Amino acid sequence: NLTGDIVIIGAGAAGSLLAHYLARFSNMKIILLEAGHSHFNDPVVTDPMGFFGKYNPPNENISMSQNPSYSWQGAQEPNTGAYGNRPIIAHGMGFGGSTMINRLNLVVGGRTVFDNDWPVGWKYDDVKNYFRRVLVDINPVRDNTKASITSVALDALRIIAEQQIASGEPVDFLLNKATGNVPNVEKTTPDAVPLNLNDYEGVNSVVAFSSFYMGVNQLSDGNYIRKYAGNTYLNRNYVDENGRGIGKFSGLRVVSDAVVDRIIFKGNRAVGVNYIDREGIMHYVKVNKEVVVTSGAFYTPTILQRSGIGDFTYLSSIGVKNLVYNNPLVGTGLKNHYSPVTITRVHGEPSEVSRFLSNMAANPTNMGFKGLAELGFHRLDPNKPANANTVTYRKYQLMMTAGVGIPAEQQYLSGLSPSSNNLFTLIADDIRFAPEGYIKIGTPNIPRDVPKIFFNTFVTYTPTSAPADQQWPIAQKTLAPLISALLGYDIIYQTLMSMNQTARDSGFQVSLEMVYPLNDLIYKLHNGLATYGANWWHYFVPTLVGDDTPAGREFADTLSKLSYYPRVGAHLDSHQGCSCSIGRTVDSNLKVIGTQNVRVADLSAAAFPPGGNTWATASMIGARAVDLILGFPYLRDLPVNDVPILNVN
Amino acid sequence: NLTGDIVIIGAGAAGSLLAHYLARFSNMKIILLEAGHSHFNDPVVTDPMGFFGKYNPPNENISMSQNPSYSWQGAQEPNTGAYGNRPIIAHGMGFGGSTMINRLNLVVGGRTVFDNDWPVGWKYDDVKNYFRRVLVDINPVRDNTKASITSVALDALRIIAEQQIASGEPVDFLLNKATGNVPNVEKTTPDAVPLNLNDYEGVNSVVAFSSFYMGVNQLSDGNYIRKYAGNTYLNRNYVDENGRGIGKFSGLRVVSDAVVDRIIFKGNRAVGVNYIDREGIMHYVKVNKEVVVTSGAFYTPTILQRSGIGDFTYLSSIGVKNLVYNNPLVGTGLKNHYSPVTITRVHGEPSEVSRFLSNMAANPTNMGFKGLAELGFHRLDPNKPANANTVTYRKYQLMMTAGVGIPAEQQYLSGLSPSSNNLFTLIADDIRFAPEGYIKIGTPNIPRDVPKIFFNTFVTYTPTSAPADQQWPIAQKTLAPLISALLGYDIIYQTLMSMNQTARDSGFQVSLEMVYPLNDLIYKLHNGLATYGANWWHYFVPTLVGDDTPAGREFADTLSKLSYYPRVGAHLDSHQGCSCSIGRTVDSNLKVIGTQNVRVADLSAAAFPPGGNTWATASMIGARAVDLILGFPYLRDLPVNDVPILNVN
Ligand SMILES: Cc1cc2nc3c(=O)[nH]c(=O)nc-3n(C[C@H](O)[C@H](O)[C@H](O)COP(=O)(O)OP(=O)(O)OC[C@H]3O[C@@H](n4cnc5c(N)ncnc54)[C@H](O)[C@@H]3O)c2cc1C
Numbered sequence A, B: 001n002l003t004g005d006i007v008i009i010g011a012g013a014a015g016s017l018l019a020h021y022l023a024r025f026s027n028m029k030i031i032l033l034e035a036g037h038s039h040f041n042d043p044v045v046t047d048p049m050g051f052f053g054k055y056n057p058p059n060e061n062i063s064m065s066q067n068p069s070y071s072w073q074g075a076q077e078p079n080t081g082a083y084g085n086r087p088i089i090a091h092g093m094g095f096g097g098s099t100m101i102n103r104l105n106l107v108v109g110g111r112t113v114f115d116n117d118w119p120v121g122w123k124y125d126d127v128k129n130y131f132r133r134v135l136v137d138i139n140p141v142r143d144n145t146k147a148s149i150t151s152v153a154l155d156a157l158r159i160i161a162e163q164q165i166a167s168g169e170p171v172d173f174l175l176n177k178a179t180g181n182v183p184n185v186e187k188t189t190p191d192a193v194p195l196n197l198n199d200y201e202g203v204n205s206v207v208a209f210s211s212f213y214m215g216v217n218q219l220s221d222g223n224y225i226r227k228y229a230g231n232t233y234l235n236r237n238y239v240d241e242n243g244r245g246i247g248k249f250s251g252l253r254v255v256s257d258a259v260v261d262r263i264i265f266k267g268n269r270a271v272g273v274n275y276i277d278r279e280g281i282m283h284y285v286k287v288n289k290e291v292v293v294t295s296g297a298f299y300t301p302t303i304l305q306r307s308g309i310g311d312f313t314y315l316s317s318i319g320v321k322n323l324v325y326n327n328p329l330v331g332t333g334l335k336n337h338y339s340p341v342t343i344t345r346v347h348g349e350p351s352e353v354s355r356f357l358s359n360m361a362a363n364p365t366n367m368g369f370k371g372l373a374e375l376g377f378h379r380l381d382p383n384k385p386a387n388a389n390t391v392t393y394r395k396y397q398l399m400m401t402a403g404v405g406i407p408a409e410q411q412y413l414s415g416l417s418p419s420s421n422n423l424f425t426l427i428a429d430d431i432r433f434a435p436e437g438y439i440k441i442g443t444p445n446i447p448r449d450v451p452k453i454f455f456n457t458f459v460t461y462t463p464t465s466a467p468a469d470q471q472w473p474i475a476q477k478t479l480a481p482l483i484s485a486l487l488g489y490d491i492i493y494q495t496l497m498s499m500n501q502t503a504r505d506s507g508f509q510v511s512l513e514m515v516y517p518l519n520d521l522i523y524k525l526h527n528g529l530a531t532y533g534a535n536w537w538h539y540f541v542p543t544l545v546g547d548d549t550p551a552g553r554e555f556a557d558t559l560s561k562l563s564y565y566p567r568v569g570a571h572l573d574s575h576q577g578c579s580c581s582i583g584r585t586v587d588s589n590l591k592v593i594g595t596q597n598v599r600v601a602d603l604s605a606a607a608f609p610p611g612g613n614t615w616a617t618a619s620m621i622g623a624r625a626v627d628l629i630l631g632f633p634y635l636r637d638l639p640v641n642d643v644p645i646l647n648v649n
């Protein structure tokens, strides 16, 4: 059988990177266990456009994140904040985990969230060199096609940014503390310099730009290949077809189609690991030094819980025999991001409209994204952190795509066809998403697609009999996600209306109408914000206001009608994390509290969600785990011209 | 490790009965492997009101079919016929399988379906004695509470059956051949005799009645207990706390929390089974004679496929190492039933509406069902079997319950609140549901909650360039589920229109109006049927009808709008079966075609779905399996006064 010093469970964004550099920088035997196998020869994965269904059979037309051959199908419990819906969120199953199946938008997350929401030792300056390593190993690219709509939008954001600065207000969504009075929006002059949202020093917290950075590389023939954690760190230059490491990496052994069951303990020391191989026969792996769990946000706590680490009372109740350490926090504090969708219609001469919307087609260097920004809090969000006026937090990720991004049922109901040549999509993604959830295993036997995953989003506040003033502080906290989602709509509404101006100024005979959610409803909202000011959101709870005006019943009704849209007209991001966070399940050194030699090194260990997509943070965490395990800053101090060399096969 | 003569996988509706009676009638070593455990001491299962959430924690308020601790979570692939939805369909996990978590409505299925849709040897007279055994072992009870609305609905149906008989027409939904000219509707006079839909000879194919039959028994203290496969056949009188048989049953061995991975073969002969226990350790069980799979419609074909039985090219493509027999049909032909919901509002004085709607509350003896019938084809359904006029087929199971049975998102859009005191639910369940789907494993390693389950329902027909005449027979077959669902609405509409009469005749000063779907639409539908006749469903494809009149575009429009309602205003049943049906994956003696000694004895073997709920048919199959294996009609001939004895613990 196999015996190792370090056993790593899960070859995701964290596991791949962790295994790679541990083998390089030590002479220990590194054993990496993965539930799936490599997909280096699969065009659905290695062609970036595979994400959009280029290679889908027309009879089984499903994305990788809908496909059990490519992923874990994590079906959550009924969402009490979304009509009982049960969304299915995926973890990639294969070399590289979810980076094997994601949309490849690589985003650091910015300085502020690490300086403020992570503990000492995990502040932005403690992690920035590792983020730099994660980026240069991928070496991501920018959009190869400039679209007129991008510049018109950027020019629209600039005008708004100037108004917000000129007004002198303390907090608003285009303000950026590190750039002062100069609107931090990329210019549209002919040879303008790009603004980099991943800038090394974290200056660009709030920033508007023309391009994200995509995880693809160009091959000699001009085609693009997916550049993910899988083929960057486990390609054939480093790991052969039998899974044995090569050369300086020969201590590494990578087991494919190996589904891990439990960590076996002696006292509070892990000494072995279970897994079922591709034939369905169970094997034992002996452990000499450490076990590192990197199985993703949904499934890392399930491994710990199946292993005897969690709420003893609960774990006993479903039949876990061998209990190890009692910590009720295992699996709690699950966070995510959330993207409510908006649709816009372009009016005007068909030829002028076709011109205005040109160059937006998805290709590998943009994956569909034509902008736009990382934005801050709306001035009227009552739930800002205390120091939001002295440091600039990230709140919204503003993305613009072509086409109609609402689900098919919403397309039917709204009358908005994906084949109209005059519609496009704006999304204000909440990346400081208030809701919190938890994960519990339902059975002790085997790893399952579906543990109990509780995650309630846009819940309602039920009024009590107490005086109103005693209720508002509780309601403000409960309604926190509805409030942020609706204000994101107002941000897009503002943007669209300046675009009406900057589009004419750029010579386009067009005008724009927000059509999803209803233009009529959004207008009323915008007006409501100006009429009722800081406390507009009280009308989510109409009975406690006692405004018996025709105008008051009407705004309360508008908020009611609008509360529908973030519930069904949205796409839950697949950015789940924090379910075993630092200070709750593991300590500052990623060691699982209560054990001698178990660590967690994936996104489940994260103290707080990064301000943006989550791939970069995941690989960053595994990267720091490399130096923590070796006891020297090998990875932090590695020069930036030293990268893994890509082998496509 | 263990050794047995017959190894049974899954203690479901079939597994429990098969294990019980095999132990009794033979001296063989019978080993029953079950993934879950007994819930004899869990009030959520053994108290029938637990199904409705009596013991649910208020913060995790979820039914058993939503709970991984009680069930497998079968999330299906996106439904191309329902806006991409992914409903999650459960199999119970524990002693009694799905009978442990279901709504307990015990229905045989009627004679016609077995006489016409099952193979030689499985005709009604071949199976009726086994059905009789299944019923007397449970001994279901009828509703303990007569409600006025039931009698009002029945008297309305009587009037409708009489019009249908009088008209001399060959096929309609209240006609029943075996009872001729006497309307087969239970009488509502004071001391009327009940109609039994499960009558032994199968006379009542189409029949209206006041009560279904529930799987509960009354205890001496007046409380009701759930009477399911688990505690009927595997309670402490028969199997001790260690899973070992008692007395005459000592050959039986029941292993709990045993998740089976594969069946091991030597040649085309099974010699073993592997399983994972609750500690996460794999065991091997030796097989001397036979292996019987009774793991449910979703998971029976997955065990075979993981074992090397199925489409070889595909099983290779996902990494199954050991192939055994090539049968591309394994897992194909999956069927289900489907229940679109209708909501009715009662108008009148609040006190008189309240009286009309009294006594409809769910209690253990009715589980909410207050009627009503098994109905036949609507006369304007073009997809009847050839002999639909010489034998009476079951097509709709018409059920009436209290409250508002549409999903929460639909309650909001329609304004139909579950707390309005004046709404009730009528359901015409398509129990000859046209759609056919299939199951394939996504990975070779382990049993999973979520294999690929493709099941597309209310798909659209896309017109080709061919002449209309060549397309209609295709369009007729494609649109079959939409056609039947809509006609189900009309059946309810007709009933409601007569109930307006019969409510006055019974002294209720109320009026009834169908409000979900919109009354206007159903009205327009009813007129459309009389106007365009047999070829009304052509207007699903308006461009092929070339009717550009206002009356024509309007009817085409009415149908487009109604197609929305069965897709989202409904509940997919958990009556899945036929995925390893007789004549395709197994032969008439339940043996897996291609093996020496493997059988399938659960609902996945079913040739065609029973005309009604599926528990009974499932146990019926397990029952013949007892006789088929032992080679004698032991069970067919056992006297009906010899029943299993109930032990509550
Ligand atoms: C559809 C989709 C779109 C996304 N879009 C983007 C994007 O555009 N940009 C971005 O920055 N991020 C995106 N992500 C998120 C990003 O990819 C993840 O956050 C990142 O992979 C998380 O890193 P991780 O190591 O913690 O998790 P994972 O990458 O998911 O690592 C999990 C690995 O562990 C394995 N594993 C799990 N359980 C077991 C077990 N019991 N035994 C053995 N192995 C196991 C899994 O097979 C998997 O390989 C998206 C993800 C998805 C699924």
Ligand SMILES: Cc1cc2nc3c(=O)[nH]c(=O)nc-3n(C[C@H](O)[C@H](O)[C@H](O)COP(=O)(O)OP(=O)(O)OC[C@H]3O[C@@H](n4cnc5c(N)ncnc54)[C@H](O)[C@@H]3O)c2cc1C
Pocket: B009, B010, B011, B012, B013, B014, B015, B033, B034, B035, B036, B065, B090, B091, B092, B093, B094, B095, B096, B097, B098, B099, B101, B102, B103, B104, B105, B106, B107, B258, B259, B260, B261, B294, B295, B296, B297, B299, B303, B447, B574, B575, B576, B602, B603, B604, B613, B614, B615, B616, B618, B619
């Ligand atoms: C929510 C719900 C409501 C329903 N309501 C009704 C109703 O009102 N009336 C009605 O007649 N029917 C209803 N049923 C459906 C009916 O109960 C099923 O069709 C019937 O029980 C089928 O039984 P079965 O033998 O085919 O398999 P099942 O009853 O489903 O049992 C299969 C068993 O095999 C086990 N198993 C699966 N895989 C493995 C493995 N790898 N290793 C070990 N064990 C395994 C499962 O745990 C399960 O215990 C309902 C079902 C559900 C879930």
